[PDB]
């Protein structure tokens, strides 16, 4: 039962930073605590174990310190392939448990998104099947929130999000959102609406059809 | 080169069960204690089982005791993950990660990873059906085409209850899709009408649909 | 890679009847077979190992014998629990292998099937798919052939059937032949035929509709 | 009474992978050679695999060599069987099947069977994608939705090539039925004719779509 506390979940840096990612046990753990690297889509990837032992071949501007309940990864000069999900995890002979994780991103200006929402085409609706498709395009930071509504009704359950890698030329992230129903549900209801609330918004914007 | 890969993943529903296997390329995992790790949709690891050498000790994670189950195959090196009753919030992808260190001691990080396996579990462990009629001085068929539940069983009966000669309900087929599709029919005079009540009872539904001319 | 071949395929008989099923093997096997009992959707059960040795439990009606190359099943007085698939099976230290199995059917006379074929609903047709039907009613035996013609071209890998057991009123089999669609797929075309051969029809039988 | 039960069973696309485990309750399995037997929709069974005691030797029906793996865990008493590379004719019901006799000998028949797990495969292992557009003195956006392909991935061009400023792709996502969607998007002038170039070389499928008001 002990629990492993991992801050900041969202760190913004550049290219040459020093940067410093905390773990902090709920009680002593000597120094059993190790430092790992993931990619999207990939393998995790040890960096550090024993609190500040580096894995050979790892690079070191990778280093770890720590001891008893209070545990620090710092990166001294980031570098591009550096930006990832970090995670520390204390481990033990016959289990582990990992902290929350804390994603390393590119720090860049905040940009409120652009947002469009597009009905299903015909020939889509003709063989059963409505899609709706709200897009929130080129904003920063990634933490955004969309909500359906349907005649002024919260939907859930019945949409899927999908995120872009911070993008190569702008450092912005994009996003859809695809609402799914059967010919019979969407002919249902009249007004399909879209909410998007970011940190570059004044208020919420809502984007809708009829 | 050291490797891991799983294999097995793909979409359950909710309650059913399913199972992983990893095997292994250029190293034996006898020495090895060996691990299952998910990655979950808000981005986070969870570790998910252990399993010693020879097997001594299984560790589960609070979340999946009672539901999941580790072995290990020395002779051939593979590791397999049970999972069973599963849940929404087991969505994630499973890796296996050996646990191990240059030099092996009494308590070593993980140093070797697969790449992972996607299980997606969906929240909908039941399906009602969709009833469609099947329409017809001598001998006519008609019936009731009862398609996409899940899970079996479904039941038919006629007039509720009233109309029990020449009643032939099939046994169910099962889809592509993954769902369940039957028929019933009877033959009756060709010279009154007719109602087919279709009970489902793993989706607490229960349809009753006319079937003319 | 010694090869079992059991006979015959089927087999139709009475309540009281005495009947054999036999199995040959390619080569000697000394006695090392082994009889099976199987009911639809059930697991199989042992009545029979060393070609000969009843299993404990079994009833004695059950006998088996032969040795080398040629092994018979006996059953001396057919009970109504008796109709089933039977399989033989060789078996070695670290493998087996089993014969083509016997299902044993209660005899009755030969029975043309009636033949009826459904469209799809409009109501289906809607939400985009059509399903269409064929009915073999109350046939005997078993052995029937459907085919689906759509404008006179034989459909293959769309359909399913399903059969029923042997009715408990009149010993006949039915079968249904279900061949799904889509919306546009079913559009595309006119005649919808289904064509049945059975011992019991002098000639194939077409249904169809526009 | 001695139980045998089979987990894991379901859909597989030809080409993918799945993987079977046996439990038992009432005995142990570790005296006991254990077998997975198959029964095809012909009817008849086919012996698929075995492993005898310690796993000392595994053997594998020849249509099955190479791609099924046999393993045993004799603490915890389950056997295993993995499946790769599955092909329609390994459509059927899975039993696991006990090798014993009232007093163990050196050749026993099949003395205790589990009820059995159903395993279908169906013959498709790719499907091309269907192609939606997403319809628009400013700034305007437009795309294509990429729906109901298997398996990954897709490729999205527009105007052969020709337009790249601008264009997102986005991530595919699975839907709860196992076909992949995404879609691609492109802001362009308000104030020229749009065409999105999807290909999907698992099906050997290409589709051109043009996206107009
Ligand atoms: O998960 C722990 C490690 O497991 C693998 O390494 C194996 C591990 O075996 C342990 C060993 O236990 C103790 C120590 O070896 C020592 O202090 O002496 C004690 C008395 O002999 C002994 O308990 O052996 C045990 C079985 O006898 C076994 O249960 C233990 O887990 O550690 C040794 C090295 O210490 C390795 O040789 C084993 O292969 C690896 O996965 C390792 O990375 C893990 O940390
Ligand atoms: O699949 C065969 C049987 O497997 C299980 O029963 C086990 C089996 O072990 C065999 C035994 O081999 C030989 C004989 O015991 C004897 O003639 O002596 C020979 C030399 O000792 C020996 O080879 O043990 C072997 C390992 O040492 C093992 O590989 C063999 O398969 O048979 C014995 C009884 O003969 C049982 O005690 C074992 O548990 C059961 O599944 C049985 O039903 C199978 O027929």
């Known amino acids: 039962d002990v629990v492993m506390t991992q801050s900041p979940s969202t760190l913004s840096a550049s290219v040459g930073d020093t940067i410093t990612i905390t773990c902090?046990?709920?009680?002593?753990?000597?120094?059993?605590?190790?430092?790992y690297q993931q990619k999207p889509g990939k393998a995790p990837k040890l960096?550090?174990?024993?609190?500040?032992?580096?894995?050979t071949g790892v690079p070191s501007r990778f280093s770890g310190s720590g001891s008893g309940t209070e545990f620090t990864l710092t990166i001294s000069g980031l570098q591009f392939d550096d930006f990832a999900t970090?995670?520390?995890?204390?481990?033990?002979?016959?289990?582990?448990?990992?902290?929350?994780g804390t994603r390393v991103e590119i720090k860049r200006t905040v940009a409120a998104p652009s947002v469009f929402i597009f009905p299903p085409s015909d020939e889509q609706l003709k063989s059963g099947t409505a899609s709706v498709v709200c897009l929130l395009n080129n904003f920063y930071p990634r933490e955004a929130k969309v909500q359906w509504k349907v005649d002024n009704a919260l939907q859930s359950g019945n949409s899927q999000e999908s995120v872009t890698e911070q993008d190569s030329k702008d450092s912005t992230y994009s996003l859809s959102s695809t609402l799914t129903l059967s010919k019979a549900d969407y002919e249902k209801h009249k007004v399909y609406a879209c909410e998007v609330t970011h940190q570059g918004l004044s208020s919420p914007v809502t984007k809708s059809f009829n | 080169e050291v490797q891991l890969v799983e294999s097995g993943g793909g979409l359950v529903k909710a309650g059913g069960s399913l199972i992983l296997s990893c095997?292994?390329?250029?190293?034996?995992?006898?020495?090895?204690?060996?691990?299952?790790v998910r990655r979950v949709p808000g981005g986070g690891l969870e570790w998910?089982?252990?399993?010693?050498?020879?097997?001594?000790?299984?560790?589960?994670?609070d979340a999946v005791k009672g539901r999941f189950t580790v072995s290990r195959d020395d002779l051939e090196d593979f590791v397999y993950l049970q999972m069973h009753k599963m849940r929404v919030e087991d969505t994630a992808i499973?890796?296996?990660?050996?646990?191990?260190?240059?030099?092996?001691?009494?308590?070593?990080?993980?140093?070797?990873?697969?790449?992972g396996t996607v299980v997606t579990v969906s929240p909908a462990s039941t399906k009602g059906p969709s009833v469609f009629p099947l329409a017809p001085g001598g001998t006519a068929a008609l019936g009731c085409l009862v398609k996409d539940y899940f899970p079996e069983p479904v039941t038919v009966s006629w007039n509720s209850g009233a109309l029990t000669s020449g009643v032939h309900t099939f046994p169910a087929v099962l889809q592509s899709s993954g769902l369940y599709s039957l028929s019933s029919v009877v033959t009756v005079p060709s010279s009154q009408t007719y109602i087919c009540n279709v009970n489902h009872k793993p989706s607490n539904t229960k349809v009753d649909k006319k079937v003319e001319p | 890679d010694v090869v079992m071949t059991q006979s015959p395929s089927t087999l139709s008989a009475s309540v009281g009847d005495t009947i054999t099923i036999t199995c040959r093997a390619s080569?000697?096997?000394?006695?090392?077979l082994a009889w099976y009992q199987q009911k639809p959707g059930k697991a199989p059960k042992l009545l029979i190992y060393?070609?000969?040795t009843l299993k404990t439990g079994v009833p004695s009606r059950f006998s088996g014998s032969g040795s080398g190359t040629e092994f018979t099943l006996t059953i001396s007085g057919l009970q109504f629990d008796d109709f089933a698939t039977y399989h033989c099976?060789?078996?070695?230290?670290?493998?087996?292998?089993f014969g083509q199995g016997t299902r044993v059917e209660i005899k009755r006379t030969v029975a043309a099937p009636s033949v009826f074929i459904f469209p799809p609903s409009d109501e289906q047709l809607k939400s985009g798919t059509a399903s269409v039907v064929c009915l073999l009613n109350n046939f005997y035996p078993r052995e029937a052939k459907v085919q689906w013609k759509v404008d006179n071209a034989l459909q293959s890998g769309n359909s399913q059937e399903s059969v029923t057991e042997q009715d408990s009123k009149d010993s006949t089999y039915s079968l249904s032949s279900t061949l799904t669609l889509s919306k546009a797929d079913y559009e595309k075309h006119k005649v919808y035929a289904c064509e049945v051969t059975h011992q019991g029809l002098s000639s194939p039988v077409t249904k169809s509709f526009n | 009474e001695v139980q045998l039960v089979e987990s894991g069973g379901g859909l597989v696309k030809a080409g993918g992978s799945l993987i079977l485990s046996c439990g038992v309750s009432?005995?142990?399995?570790?005296?006991?050679?254990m077998n997975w037997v198959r029964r095809v929709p012909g009817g008849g069974l086919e012996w698929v695999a075995s492993?005898?005691?310690?796993?000392?030797?595994?053997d594998y029906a020849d249509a099955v060599k190479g791609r099924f793996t046999v393993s045993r865990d004799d603490l915890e008493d389950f056997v295993y069987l993995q499946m790769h590379k599955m092909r329609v004719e390994d459509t059927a019901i899975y039993y696991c099947?006990?090798?014993?006799?009232?007093?163990?000998?050196?050749?026993?028949?099949?003395?205790?069977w589990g009820p059995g797990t159903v395993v279908t495969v169906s013959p498709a292992s790719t499907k091309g994608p269907s192609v939606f557009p997403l319809a628009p003195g400013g700034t305007a956006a437009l795309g294509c939705l990429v729906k109901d392909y298997f398996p990954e991935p897709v490729t999205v061009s527009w105007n052969s090539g020709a337009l790249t400023s601008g264009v997102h792709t986005f991530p595919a996502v699975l839907q709860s039925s196992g076909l992949y969607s995404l879609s691609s998007v492109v802001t362009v002038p308000s104030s020229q004719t749009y065409i999105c170039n999807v290909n999907h070389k698992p099906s050997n499928t290409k589709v051109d779509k043009k996206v107009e008001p």
């Open positions: 099947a006990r090798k014993g006799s009232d007093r163990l000998s050196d050749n026993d028949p099949f003395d205790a």
């Open positions: 009432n005995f142990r399995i570790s005296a006991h050679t």
């Open positions: 492993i005898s005691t310690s796993s000392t030797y595994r």
């Open positions: 080569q000697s096997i000394e006695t090392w």
């Open positions: 060393k070609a000969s």
């Open positions: 099976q060789h078996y070695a230290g670290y493998s087996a292998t």
